Amino acid sequence: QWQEDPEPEDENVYAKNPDFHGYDSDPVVDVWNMRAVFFFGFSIVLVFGTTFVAYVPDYRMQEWARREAERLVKYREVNGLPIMESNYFDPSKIQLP
Amino acid sequence: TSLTLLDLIWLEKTIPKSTSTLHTNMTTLTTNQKGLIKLYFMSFLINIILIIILYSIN
Amino acid sequence: MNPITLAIIYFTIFLGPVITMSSTNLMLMWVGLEFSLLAIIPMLINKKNPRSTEAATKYFVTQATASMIILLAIVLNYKQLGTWMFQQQTNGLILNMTLMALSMKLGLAPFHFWLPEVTQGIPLHMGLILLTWQKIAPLSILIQIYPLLNSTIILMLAITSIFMGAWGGLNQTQMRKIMAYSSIAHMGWMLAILPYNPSLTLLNLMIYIILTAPMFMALMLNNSMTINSISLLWNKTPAMLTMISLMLLSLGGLPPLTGFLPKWIIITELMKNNCLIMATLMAMMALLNLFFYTRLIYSTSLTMFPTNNNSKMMTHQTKTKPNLMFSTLAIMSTMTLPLAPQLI
Amino acid sequence: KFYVREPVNAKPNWLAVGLSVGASVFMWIYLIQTHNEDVLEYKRRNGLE
Amino acid sequence: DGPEKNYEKTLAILQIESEKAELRLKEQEVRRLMRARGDGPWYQFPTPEKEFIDHSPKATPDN
Amino acid sequence: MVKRFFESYHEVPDGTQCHRKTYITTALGGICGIIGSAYSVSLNPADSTLEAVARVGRYTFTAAAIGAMFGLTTCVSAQVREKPDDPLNYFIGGCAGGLTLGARTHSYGTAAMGCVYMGTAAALFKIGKLEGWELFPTPKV
Amino acid sequence: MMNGRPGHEPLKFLPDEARSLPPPKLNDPRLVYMGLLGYCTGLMDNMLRMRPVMRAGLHRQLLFVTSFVFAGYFYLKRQNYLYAVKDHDMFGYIKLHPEDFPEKEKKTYAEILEPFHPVR
Amino acid sequence: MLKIILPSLMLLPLTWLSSPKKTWTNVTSYSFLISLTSLTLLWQTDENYKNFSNMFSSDPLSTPLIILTAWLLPLMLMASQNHLKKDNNVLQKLYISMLISLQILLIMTFSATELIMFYILFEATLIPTLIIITRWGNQTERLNAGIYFLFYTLIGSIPLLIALILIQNHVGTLNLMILSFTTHTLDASWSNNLLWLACMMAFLIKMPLYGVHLWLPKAHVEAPIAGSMILAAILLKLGSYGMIRISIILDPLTKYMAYPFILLSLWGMIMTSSICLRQTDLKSLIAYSSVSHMALVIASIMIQTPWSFMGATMLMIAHGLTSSLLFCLANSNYERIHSRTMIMARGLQMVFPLMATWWLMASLANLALPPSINLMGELFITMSLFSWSNFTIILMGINIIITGMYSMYMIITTQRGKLTNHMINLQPSHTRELTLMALHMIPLILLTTSPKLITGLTM
Amino acid sequence: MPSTFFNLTMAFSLSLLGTLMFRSHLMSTLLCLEGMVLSLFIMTSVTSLNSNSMSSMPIPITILVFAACEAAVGLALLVKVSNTYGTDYVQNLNLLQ
Amino acid sequence: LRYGLLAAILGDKTTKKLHEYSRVITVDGNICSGKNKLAKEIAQQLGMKHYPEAGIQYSSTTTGDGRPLDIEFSGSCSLEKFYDDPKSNDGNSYRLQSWLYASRLLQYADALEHLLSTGQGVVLERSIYSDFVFLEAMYNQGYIRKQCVDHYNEIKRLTLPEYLPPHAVIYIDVPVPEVQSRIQKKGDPHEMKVTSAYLQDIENAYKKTFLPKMSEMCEVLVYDSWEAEDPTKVVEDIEYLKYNKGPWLKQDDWTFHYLRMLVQDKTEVLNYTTIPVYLPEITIGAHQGSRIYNSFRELPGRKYAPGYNAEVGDKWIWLK
Amino acid sequence: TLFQLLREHWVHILVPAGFVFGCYLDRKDDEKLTAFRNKSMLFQRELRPNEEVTWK
Amino acid sequence: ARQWQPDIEWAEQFSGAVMYPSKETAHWKPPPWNDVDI
Amino acid sequence: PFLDIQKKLGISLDRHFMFLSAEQPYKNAARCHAFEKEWIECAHGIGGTRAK
Ligand SMILES: Nc1nc2c(ncn2[C@H]2C[C@H](O)[C@@H](COP(=O)(O)OP(=O)(O)OP(=O)(O)O)O2)c(=O)[nH]1
Ligand SMILES: [Mg+2]
């Protein structure tokens, strides 16, 4: 038989210390690691980032496009133009082959 | 059909391990020389004749 | 080996590439190639084992008959032109004689069969001076005559050297033989690029020298002969493990390390020179370099292999076999792909 | 006294340390005077200051 | 900052890379015509030197 | 005269001139088998010169068989489909050639390997000659 | 190419026109990368020679950073000269042959007819 | 962009120059600050795409991928902690260094003005994922899995290099907006067809569909949790960003070269959903689930509908967060029982009440919940493929039947049941693991709340 | 002259066929190598005599000195091979496989 | 500085160092034959260096800290465990014998380094030219196997003939009942437990294998126990020996310099005894080797290279 | 002011220092791409007299 | 519990003269480590 | 050359017997000396591709 160390048994970390939070087995480092990832990850990134995301203005130009669509539909119905022409580019501007 | 026959055994037999078997067969047919310099120099003579024939057709 | 003949043999193996890269007389760089052959032979035999004399006479008979074929090419240049230097209006037979002889001394794949057997019988610090420094000089005359080289024989030599450097390393599990085969694939690359841009031949030569020379110094550092002997590195010297891993995968040629950049610039100049499917075949058959290098990297630094009980004295004793040149060419290889236009 | 066999690098080679530090100091001084001389030479050569 | 910074920065990037396209295609065509004809500086393969011809009168009269 | 004899592959399209089409494809296979049998005899020698020339005859019989039936199957596939400008006749001719190579060496796995690999190579050669690709280009750039 | 260019001084590292080029700055990212390379050279050499990789060999790390920045500044000046003289030879050949490199008067998008390829 | 790239590059002396007690807390807190400073790319007040420099650009399709990279780095560094509670300090810092370097080059790959920079940092992923898998894998077959991953991706990526250098020497600069705007139509030529296959085969291997799907379950059952989360949640979809960005060169040829890849995609997703009905390994079941959810977006980018691209990008970030949460739950069960068989560990809801709730939410986002981005992306892909052909909806209907069956099969197998009582070592759920799946799921809930960020390139 | 030069080219092609095969000994191959030395001297001296380029008369003594010096190196190499073996033959050298 | 070629060309040649009072003596016998007392008296009388018998803990007290390390660091074998259970299922006998042979290989390297450095002679009890007799006595008693014998013969074929043989081989022969009487009179409770057949086997193996192997090539002087108790006659017969027949009379100064190059650094000395041959007696597994390396580096003095440990008190760590 | 606390809390500088260096190098790259400035036809405006640059 | 490491049967498959054997490569001796043949 | 050290140092070491029309001992001109002289002075820095 070759010289190998045996399989190390999975000891109960909750039997070692009761306030085991999943981090390194030093309990002060474990508790402050939990406080650091909760305050730096769940507190100031999810909530502040949700605030920054919800107060990004006119994302993908949607609010300005709705206001310019209201202004354009109001202008076309005031001056009597049809509400969308069939061709976008002008046939007088185009050069046919 | 789907687990054993297609994914485990035949897509594995066709895409990775067919090229693995082909390259294994190519390496066993390439690196199997007897170490004699006579056989090496006869192969050298044959490929020198090949370079001469390639020049004469080009 | 007294220091007098040590200094003269090292000065002659320095001198032969110097007169080869300096002179423009074709017989004068034949003379430099003969100095290269002459000064390599007692370094090959100086360990005095029975495999070393066999490798030395294999090297002598192959390199000496290649010296006679290139001397036929120089004498037929003297008949056809009356000068010595290869000029434009010469016959293609003499240039094919030159390319066949220089591929014999360089070790490309219709002539490669001496190179693993020559590298197997010799110690590692002769593989340092044979695998890098010896192959500067036949490459340098082949750089010097680059409009005259015929692209059909150049590309068939390139395809066969890429194919057999792919197909010689996977079966065979010794380190000196496996890096002779990987070197054969690397001169397949720097013989593929040769009539198109010789500055990239110089670039692939310089990258292959700074990628193979510290790797042979790392083999020299523990005298790791086999794949299991380099697998014992985690108990001999574990500190070099990620550097020899980065150098191994860079000699295979993965980004963001430097060995992709010869493949990238060879593919760049080859698709500028309109050669599509043959450079495609070269870059597709280049992956077996990563097959033997991924098996070798799983041996040395990604799986810890079984050691033995007598390696604990290798943990005990101090080691001074690291050199400064290993570390500076190691990191100058393994992190220079963001410096690649200045490396051109 | 800790090691029973005295190491080769127990004391630093002071000539090597001074040669390395003075070579880097001379090489930085040469680089900054080469860069200032090349900037002034390029400003003389292009005709625009 | 405003969208004008991103727009004019994008226009500077597009100008720089479009001129990079025209000089890379121009570099390929210049190198192709230089290897074809050799009129300019690049790709000039060397000739033997003019100086080492003996221009002294010789023993043979006509050579 | 060997190269201009071998350039009857492209001056007349497939679906015509089938006997000398099969003859030049058998001659290409015989040249490749002669140099492969010379490589095999010079690398791994037999115990007798009779066994070495039997190895030469077996190797050139295998290579002349795959060349002859590859050229004949792509010619009769051009006969059946009556289209010269496609790569699928070269695909099915390369698959029939690899099938006959694996039937000669008596293994159906390398018959399928030779079918897919030489069908890919034959379709690549036909697609290169259709789109004017250069195998060995002169340096121009 | 550059070996065959006329007016070439043989085996010259920096000719007189490299002084006519603007020299590179010390804040350039290639020299910043080479200073990082010299520090990584000292870290890797101390790691292999079994040293404290930050504390020990500070003079060797300083020589590595200084020699790496020195070689990189000199090679960067030479490579900037080589790419500038490639641009000069190309622009001179363009000025020599406008009938071999004509101006491409591209027609406008109203005049040309791109074929429309709908996906559905 | 450099305020996201360069402090992530300065996370390396944070790893290597701190105390070994404090590496995990400093690197996780500052990588959460990296994600907070990587929320800055959402300042699109116009359809002009953000180009910070000539090196790096920000795209509306690439920005939830770039927040998923910078958000996926602390979720990997949480999950590696009890995985590496017994290994020593320099291997722990090498794992953190390889994870951080993978994050740096994934950020730099997603910010690509130029497609050859994209190829350099696309093939730069192949080293550190192989370092994670073939050193810290816990079974025998990790060498074979690393060889499979490395060579599937390199035999895909070599003709991508061939076609990129050929396209560059044909037309000029490989900048993405330059080659978007100045380009021309491609002629129907067979060399252009081989150019199509050459430039698409790398992404066709990296997203698993049939023929070439087989490297993913080997490199997911032989991976660690950080390698499995990166290979299931952003590094698989790096090729999907490439498959999006390549197709603007060559859009006229996709409408007849598209059909075998949509065919292989749809029958591969039916057969891989059918594979997941009978699977022993839970990590392999989530791996073939990722194969089916990638065959969907293979069909979705092989069609060029804009509706397809929105359903594609929604499926990208929904599949990344859902498969990362499911693989983290599989690592939690592997941590408890030291095996990955679903059959040997049943009834876990009796001892884990809230881990049953996170199991329920992950597999009930895998089964595509309607306000979630999974059915939002799959319904938009269903809309686009029914616009492509009216007979295709029965295939994806059979797929959604068997994806409901494998998701609730995994719930009913490993969560509900009799509670196998031969395990003393079912220790209760860590605060690490519960907040790790909370920081997985609460971005999916907020992404459900605001789906304007995830609309992709094309509306 | 072209008959003499083409027969010297035939003598080199014959000695190429001689040194490119092995019958029983490495020494007959080295005799073929020295036949290449003699054939290249005769070819170089015939070329210099009929071209009358007497400034390149340093070249064939350099041919003789360098090629016979490497021939002498190979002759003592066969001395070291027979010293380390006791035999001499071509089939003896298969120990590097 | 260090002994390189640059130090060798200035005049550090060993022919000026070597004189008549510079010989390699090995003093040899069975178990408890007076070899350490005779070696101390030989080195005291001729002025040579008394290298002692290299044990399992030779290398820890030779290089590094100087303290003997623990049972699993420089051990994984015990002489007491071999004397308790010789037919071991753990393979203790090969681990003891191979660790002892590599330890006396390091002792022969340090003795050749000392002799070729300062010119003073050295003694070496139970050297590597006589270390094979313990393994072949183990094999003739049946404690190890035939493949173990061939692997140790491969290790000895790698490590022996690159070195030089000892000048003088003193053997103190003593009969097997007197070996048993002195090993009972010593009083060790585990070394008492050895068998008399092992001592008889190593004695007639010594008298039939080692002495024709060594008497035909170098100088061998034999002595009885009562004749080698008083050492003045022993050191005078050492001093008045001719030293003619031997392999030390044909090498030159650069051959001695290449021997010092092969001997002075230990990374080429100890490399050939840790070659990979995977016999299960000496094969340390990967987890056990990683645990012993990551407990070896946390020992004080062995964390870094020597002369570079700031936690112990190696000064000038800032600029070195 | 303790040496152990300073040695174990100097590592917190680097990623804010990387943030400051990244913002500085991004604003240095902002100075390079200014060849199009107040010249695009969407934003071609007459410059107000309190400023000499339209965007910074 | 532990990760898998190579054993004797994994280390001995790299220990031949060649990796992939054949009918003619089965007689290949492993070479000596000091490169000297007895 | 590759390393042009003869052109750099300005000293001819192998360059004075390079072609047939080099200088000869005791001024004895070779055959085709005028043809080689006119060939080099017609290829006087023209370049190889234009000179052929
Ligand atoms: N198995 C084994 N035991 C060895 C080997 N070399 C030495 N020993 C053991 C035998 C004894 O237990 C011890 C050597 O004791 P000595 O013969 O030196 O006796 P002691 O120390 O009393 O000194 P003395 O001979 O009276 O001067 O080491 C070896 O290679 N193998
Ligand atoms: Mg005694």
mmCIF file of N, CA, C and O in Angstrom, chain I residues 67-86:
data_model
loop_
_atom_site.group_PDB
_atom_site.id
_atom_site.type_symbol
_atom_site.label_atom_id
_atom_site.label_comp_id
_atom_site.label_asym_id
_atom_site.label_seq_id
_atom_site.Cartn_x
_atom_site.Cartn_y
_atom_site.Cartn_z
ATOM 1 N N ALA I 67 36.389 20.792 -44.708
ATOM 2 C CA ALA I 67 35.728 19.515 -44.910
ATOM 3 C C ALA I 67 36.601 18.331 -44.493
ATOM 4 O O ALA I 67 36.081 17.352 -43.949
ATOM 5 N N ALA I 68 37.923 18.407 -44.661
ATOM 6 C CA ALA I 68 38.772 17.353 -44.134
ATOM 7 C C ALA I 68 38.976 17.464 -42.629
ATOM 8 O O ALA I 68 39.239 16.443 -41.987
ATOM 9 N N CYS I 69 38.807 18.657 -42.043
ATOM 10 C CA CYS I 69 38.860 18.773 -40.589
ATOM 11 C C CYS I 69 37.610 18.185 -39.944
ATOM 12 O O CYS I 69 37.705 17.496 -38.916
ATOM 13 N N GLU I 70 36.434 18.401 -40.554
ATOM 14 C CA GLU I 70 35.239 17.733 -40.038
ATOM 15 C C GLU I 70 35.243 16.239 -40.363
ATOM 16 O O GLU I 70 34.686 15.449 -39.589
ATOM 17 N N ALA I 71 35.929 15.828 -41.444
ATOM 18 C CA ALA I 71 36.133 14.406 -41.714
ATOM 19 C C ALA I 71 37.039 13.759 -40.670
ATOM 20 O O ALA I 71 36.772 12.639 -40.233
ATOM 21 N N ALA I 72 38.083 14.471 -40.232
ATOM 22 C CA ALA I 72 38.956 13.991 -39.162
ATOM 23 C C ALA I 72 38.237 13.924 -37.816
ATOM 24 O O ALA I 72 38.498 13.006 -37.017
ATOM 25 N N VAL I 73 37.324 14.876 -37.578
ATOM 26 C CA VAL I 73 36.459 14.863 -36.397
ATOM 27 C C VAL I 73 35.540 13.641 -36.409
ATOM 28 O O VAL I 73 35.394 12.949 -35.393
ATOM 29 N N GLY I 74 34.987 13.302 -37.577
ATOM 30 C CA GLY I 74 34.176 12.097 -37.681
ATOM 31 C C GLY I 74 34.954 10.792 -37.621
ATOM 32 O O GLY I 74 34.423 9.771 -37.170
ATOM 33 N N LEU I 75 36.212 10.807 -38.073
ATOM 34 C CA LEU I 75 37.084 9.637 -37.964
ATOM 35 C C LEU I 75 37.432 9.337 -36.503
ATOM 36 O O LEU I 75 37.339 8.182 -36.052
ATOM 37 N N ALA I 76 37.740 10.377 -35.717
ATOM 38 C CA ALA I 76 37.910 10.148 -34.281
ATOM 39 C C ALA I 76 36.584 9.944 -33.551
ATOM 40 O O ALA I 76 36.580 9.374 -32.452
ATOM 41 N N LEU I 77 35.463 10.376 -34.140
ATOM 42 C CA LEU I 77 34.148 10.044 -33.601
ATOM 43 C C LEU I 77 33.858 8.555 -33.739
ATOM 44 O O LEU I 77 33.287 7.943 -32.830
ATOM 45 N N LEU I 78 34.264 7.957 -34.867
ATOM 46 C CA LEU I 78 34.161 6.506 -35.025
ATOM 47 C C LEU I 78 35.140 5.769 -34.112
ATOM 48 O O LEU I 78 34.833 4.657 -33.656
ATOM 49 N N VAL I 79 36.298 6.385 -33.819
ATOM 50 C CA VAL I 79 37.219 5.854 -32.804
ATOM 51 C C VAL I 79 36.576 5.836 -31.415
ATOM 52 O O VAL I 79 36.656 4.828 -30.699
ATOM 53 N N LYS I 80 35.861 6.906 -31.050
ATOM 54 C CA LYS I 80 35.173 6.925 -29.758
ATOM 55 C C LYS I 80 33.950 6.006 -29.723
ATOM 56 O O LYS I 80 33.634 5.455 -28.660
ATOM 57 N N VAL I 81 33.286 5.803 -30.869
ATOM 58 C CA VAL I 81 32.166 4.862 -30.961
ATOM 59 C C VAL I 81 32.655 3.422 -30.789
ATOM 60 O O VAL I 81 32.092 2.649 -30.000
ATOM 61 N N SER I 82 33.751 3.065 -31.467
ATOM 62 C CA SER I 82 34.324 1.732 -31.314
ATOM 63 C C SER I 82 35.013 1.540 -29.967
ATOM 64 O O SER I 82 35.112 0.402 -29.500
ATOM 65 N N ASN I 83 35.453 2.622 -29.320
ATOM 66 C CA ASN I 83 35.975 2.516 -27.963
ATOM 67 C C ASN I 83 34.857 2.277 -26.955
ATOM 68 O O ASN I 83 35.006 1.456 -26.042
ATOM 69 N N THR I 84 33.730 2.977 -27.102
ATOM 70 C CA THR I 84 32.635 2.809 -26.154
ATOM 71 C C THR I 84 31.756 1.599 -26.458
ATOM 72 O O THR I 84 30.925 1.239 -25.618
ATOM 73 N N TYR I 85 31.921 0.954 -27.614
ATOM 74 C CA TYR I 85 31.138 -0.232 -27.935
ATOM 75 C C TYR I 85 31.967 -1.502 -28.046
ATOM 76 O O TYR I 85 31.640 -2.509 -27.413
ATOM 77 N N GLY I 86 33.036 -1.485 -28.839
ATOM 78 C CA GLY I 86 33.729 -2.682 -29.245
ATOM 79 C C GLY I 86 33.321 -3.182 -30.613
ATOM 80 O O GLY I 86 34.076 -3.936 -31.238
#
